Amino acid sequence: ETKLEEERNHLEELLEKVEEDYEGINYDEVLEALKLFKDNYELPKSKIKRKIRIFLIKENILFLNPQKGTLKPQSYLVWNAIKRML
């Protein structure tokens, strides 16, 4: 899976940045956020802290549907990288 290890390396890279580098984002809260998605593909956006949602959206991991007020992985590739890594 070139395709899936691309997004796996995307999530990997993002996760490294978050632990080491982003003093603004708690790694462990990012993990707990993303893990929600292993059980449920789409979910209310209030399930996750704003700062974190904003970040994960900015970083193309999650998509916000403003009409439905839900979050979900930006693609199935992302979703599968979550399942596999978290």
Let me know: does 4 contact 78? Beta carbons within 8 Å. Answer: no
This structure was determined by X-ray
Q: Which CATH number, 1.10.8.190, 1.10.10.10, 3.40.50.12780, 3.40.50.720, labels domain 1-86?
A: 1.10.10.10
Let me know: does 14 contact 59? Beta carbons within 8 Å. Answer: yes
The residues spanned by each domain of the chain are 1-86
CA 20/CA 26 separation, integer angstroms: 10
Q: Report CA dihedral (43, 56, 2, 75) to the nearest 10 degrees.
A: 30
Give the experimental resolution in Å: 2.2
CA 45/CA 53 separation, integer angstroms: 8
